Each structure stands twice: as C-alpha cells, then as structure tokens.
Design an enzyme around this catalytic site. Structure first.
Site, PDB file in Angstrom:
ATOM      1  N   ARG A  64       0.820  -1.211   0.000  1.00  0.00           N
ATOM      2  CA  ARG A  64       0.000   0.000   0.000  1.00  0.00           C
ATOM      3  C   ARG A  64       0.860   1.269   0.000  1.00  0.00           C
ATOM      4  O   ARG A  64       0.567   2.255  -0.679  1.00  0.00           O
ATOM      5  CB  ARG A  64      -0.944  -0.058   1.210  1.00  0.00           C
ATOM      6  CG  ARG A  64      -1.900   1.087   1.411  1.00  0.00           C
ATOM      7  CD  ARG A  64      -2.989   0.748   2.509  1.00  0.00           C
ATOM      8  NE  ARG A  64      -3.519  -0.615   2.382  1.00  0.00           N
ATOM      9  CZ  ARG A  64      -4.566  -1.010   1.631  1.00  0.00           C
ATOM     10  NH1 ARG A  64      -5.288  -0.148   0.894  1.00  0.00           N
ATOM     11  NH2 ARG A  64      -4.911  -2.321   1.626  1.00  0.00           N
ATOM     12  N   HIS A 108     -19.468  12.169   2.230  1.00  0.00           N
ATOM     13  CA  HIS A 108     -20.175  10.987   2.709  1.00  0.00           C
ATOM     14  C   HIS A 108     -21.679  11.330   2.742  1.00  0.00           C
ATOM     15  O   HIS A 108     -22.065  12.452   3.102  1.00  0.00           O
ATOM     16  CB  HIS A 108     -19.686  10.591   4.109  1.00  0.00           C
ATOM     17  CG  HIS A 108     -20.192   9.270   4.607  1.00  0.00           C
ATOM     18  ND1 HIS A 108     -19.724   8.058   4.142  1.00  0.00           N
ATOM     19  CD2 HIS A 108     -21.133   8.974   5.545  1.00  0.00           C
ATOM     20  CE1 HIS A 108     -20.345   7.075   4.769  1.00  0.00           C
ATOM     21  NE2 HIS A 108     -21.193   7.604   5.638  1.00  0.00           N
ATOM     22  N   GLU A 141      -6.850   9.122   8.734  1.00  0.00           N
ATOM     23  CA  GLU A 141      -6.391   7.736   8.522  1.00  0.00           C
ATOM     24  C   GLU A 141      -7.558   6.758   8.651  1.00  0.00           C
ATOM     25  O   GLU A 141      -7.720   5.804   7.853  1.00  0.00           O
ATOM     26  CB  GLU A 141      -5.218   7.355   9.456  1.00  0.00           C
ATOM     27  CG  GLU A 141      -3.972   8.149   9.160  1.00  0.00           C
ATOM     28  CD  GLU A 141      -2.713   7.791   9.998  1.00  0.00           C
ATOM     29  OE1 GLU A 141      -2.603   6.651  10.516  1.00  0.00           O
ATOM     30  OE2 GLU A 141      -1.811   8.670  10.091  1.00  0.00           O
ATOM     31  N   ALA A 172     -27.788  17.495  -3.007  1.00  0.00           N
ATOM     32  CA  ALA A 172     -27.139  18.262  -1.943  1.00  0.00           C
ATOM     33  C   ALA A 172     -25.601  18.152  -2.066  1.00  0.00           C
ATOM     34  O   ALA A 172     -24.881  19.131  -1.877  1.00  0.00           O
ATOM     35  CB  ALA A 172     -27.625  17.818  -0.541  1.00  0.00           C
TER      36      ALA A 172
HETATM   37  C1  DXY Z   1     -16.775   2.953   1.728  1.00  0.00           C
HETATM   38  S1  DXY Z   1     -16.244   4.432   0.860  1.00  0.00           S
HETATM   39  C2  DXY Z   1     -14.419   4.599   1.084  1.00  0.00           C
HETATM   40  C3  DXY Z   1     -14.006   5.849   1.909  1.00  0.00           C
HETATM   41  C4  DXY Z   1     -12.513   5.950   2.185  1.00  0.00           C
HETATM   42  C5  DXY Z   1     -11.814   7.350   2.094  1.00  0.00           C
HETATM   43  C6  DXY Z   1     -10.515   7.160   2.836  1.00  0.00           C
HETATM   44  C7  DXY Z   1      -9.403   6.526   2.231  1.00  0.00           C
HETATM   45  N1  DXY Z   1      -9.484   6.105   0.961  1.00  0.00           N
HETATM   46  N2  DXY Z   1      -8.282   6.295   2.919  1.00  0.00           N
HETATM   47  C8  DXY Z   1      -8.161   6.682   4.201  1.00  0.00           C
HETATM   48  N3  DXY Z   1      -7.079   6.481   4.910  1.00  0.00           N
HETATM   49  N4  DXY Z   1      -9.215   7.320   4.821  1.00  0.00           N
HETATM   50  C9  DXY Z   1     -10.371   7.540   4.164  1.00  0.00           C
HETATM   51  O1  DXY Z   1     -11.264   8.106   4.787  1.00  0.00           O
HETATM   52  C10 DXY Z   1     -13.757   3.238   1.460  1.00  0.00           C
HETATM   53  C11 DXY Z   1     -12.879   2.759   0.499  1.00  0.00           C
HETATM   54  C12 DXY Z   1     -12.209   1.563   0.633  1.00  0.00           C
HETATM   55  C13 DXY Z   1     -12.405   0.787   1.730  1.00  0.00           C
HETATM   56  C14 DXY Z   1     -11.621  -0.495   1.735  1.00  0.00           C
HETATM   57  O2  DXY Z   1     -11.723  -1.330   2.628  1.00  0.00           O
HETATM   58  N5  DXY Z   1     -10.880  -0.696   0.641  1.00  0.00           N
HETATM   59  C15 DXY Z   1     -10.082  -1.930   0.478  1.00  0.00           C
HETATM   60  C16 DXY Z   1     -10.278  -2.626  -0.894  1.00  0.00           C
HETATM   61  C17 DXY Z   1     -11.502  -2.156  -1.717  1.00  0.00           C
HETATM   62  C18 DXY Z   1     -11.378  -2.561  -3.234  1.00  0.00           C
HETATM   63  O3  DXY Z   1     -10.669  -1.849  -4.015  1.00  0.00           O
HETATM   64  O4  DXY Z   1     -12.006  -3.597  -3.577  1.00  0.00           O
HETATM   65  C19 DXY Z   1      -8.578  -1.711   0.656  1.00  0.00           C
HETATM   66  O5  DXY Z   1      -8.100  -0.595   0.409  1.00  0.00           O
HETATM   67  O6  DXY Z   1      -7.915  -2.706   1.000  1.00  0.00           O
HETATM   68  C20 DXY Z   1     -13.272   1.246   2.721  1.00  0.00           C
HETATM   69  C21 DXY Z   1     -13.954   2.456   2.594  1.00  0.00           C
END
Ligand code: DXY
Length: 205
Positions: A64, A108, A141, A172
């Site tokens: 990552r 959101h 984070e 909105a």
């Molecule tokens: C449900 S909408 C979104 C909002 C995240 C914005 C955000 C972000 N992208 N990164 C950080 N550190 N903080 C954040 O607030 C979100 C996006 C991704 C996940 C998540 O678990 N992603 C997984 C994989 C998802 C995939 O690509 O299939 C991962 O990165 O391993 C969870 C939530």
C-alpha cells in the site's frame, strides 16, 4: 489552487466540481484526475472536459505504501495543492494521509457521525430517521473520521426508496462538495495546527 481528484469508478460529483471551477471567481482548477482502475466512467468524464488523467494500478506495487507513494509522485509532478476523493476505493496509508493533512477532502452521504460506512442511504431508511444529509470532511487515517467542513441536512420523505433518497442526497452533494472545495482552495477554511477547523479572514481584498 491546483486540485487533483482521486477516483476508482464513476467519479460521482466530479462534474459538479469541474463546473464549479469554471465559475468566474473560482479559487480552484481541476488539473488532474487519477484512477486506480482503467477505463472507468470518471476518467471519461475528466477526458471529455480536457483534464489530464493517470491510471495507477495497485497490483504493480509491493504494498500500500509503495502504491500511495506512486500516487503522491504524480501529485508532486502536477504541482497539486489539494486532493478531493470521489469514490476512491483504496484505503490510503498513514504516511500519505499525514502528508496531505488539511489538503485532502471527501464526501459521505450522511450527517456524520451517523451512518458510517457503506450503504448510508439504506441505513438511514432502515433506521427511520426523518433527516439525513451529506458531509464534506478532511480525510483522516480512519474512514469517516476527520474534521468536518460543511454539512447539509436533507429530508427523508414518506415513501422514499434507496433510489429516491439517494437522488435527493446527491443533489445536496452537488452543492456542498464544490462549496467546500472553494472554501479550502480560497484559504477561507484551513485546518488549524490544533487539528480543528479555522475560518480565516484573508488579507487580500
Ligand atoms: C466505503 S467508501 C471509502 C471511503 C474511504 C476514504 C478514505 C481513504 N481512501 N483512505 C483513508 N485512509 N481514509 C479515508 O477516509 C472506502 C474505500 C475503501 C475501503 C476499503 O476497505 N478498501 C479496500 C479494498 C476495496 C477494493 O478496491 O475492492 C482496501 O483498500 O484494502 C473502505 C472504505
């Protein structure tokens, strides 16, 4: 201020953001749209608007941090000042979030801290609230954490479905995501050293 939008799909609100930057007194220009996925609709949106795009595939990197470092390098190359997330589906590393603290925003479809996580419109309907809304915040984070910039309340109407509520909240979002971007781009809203929102009176008149 030069702005990047990070996407993974349709780039919801990207057109709203673009349109806002073409307004007369805009403090922002959208200078790049970056996706982690090729050939998604949001890239076509950007390209049709004449905005540069890049695709960065997380599978090409060991982890990552390396992936995020590649995103950051593109942001570096394009002299970006502010990042908006628009449906970006990879969790950004702590080092990335730290670097961009106070300059990266997301939206959101609830009045946070309610209805964290996915499917916030369904959560609102299932819970039976009469008022929901949307929230623009600085990215932290932890997902859904981070200091709130703007919120707008939206009514839940008798008879609403996920679709009709979603459409109302989206209208909105079309309003507040660009308004928030303008606040941050203009410097009117800045993140204080104390980690709280500051509403700044600017020297330049
Ligand atoms: C449900 S909408 C979104 C909002 C995240 C914005 C955000 C972000 N992208 N990164 C950080 N550190 N903080 C954040 O607030 C979100 C996006 C991704 C996940 C998540 O678990 N992603 C997984 C994989 C998802 C995939 O690509 O299939 C991962 O990165 O391993 C969870 C939530």
């Amino acid at each position: 201020a030069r702005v990047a939008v990070l996407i993974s799909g349709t780039g919801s609100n990207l057109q709203a953001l673009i349109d806002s930057t073409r307004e007369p007194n805009s403090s922002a220009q959208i200078d790049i749209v970056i996706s982690n996925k090729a050939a998604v609709a949001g890239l076509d949106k950007a390209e049709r608007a004449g905005i540069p795009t890049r695709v960065i595939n997380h599978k090409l990197y060991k982890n990552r941090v390396e992936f995020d470092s590649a995103i950051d390098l593109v942001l570096e190359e394009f002299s970006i000042d502010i990042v908006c997330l628009a449906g970006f589906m990879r969790i950004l590393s702590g080092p990335f979030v730290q670097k961009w603290n106070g300059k990266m925003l997301n939206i959101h479809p609830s009045l946070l801290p309610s209805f964290k996580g996915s499917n916030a419109h369904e959560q609102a309907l299932e819970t039976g609230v009469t008022v929901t809304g949307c929230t623009v915040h600085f990215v932290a984070e932890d997902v859904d954490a981070g200091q709130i910039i703007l919120q707008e309340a939206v009514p839940v109407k008798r008879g609403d479905t996920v679709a009709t509520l979603s459409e109302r909240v989206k209208l909105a979002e079309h309003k507040i995501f660009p308004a928030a971007l303008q606040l941050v781009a203009s410097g009117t809203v800045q993140l204080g050293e104390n980690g709280k929102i500051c509403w700044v009176k600017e020297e330049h008149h």
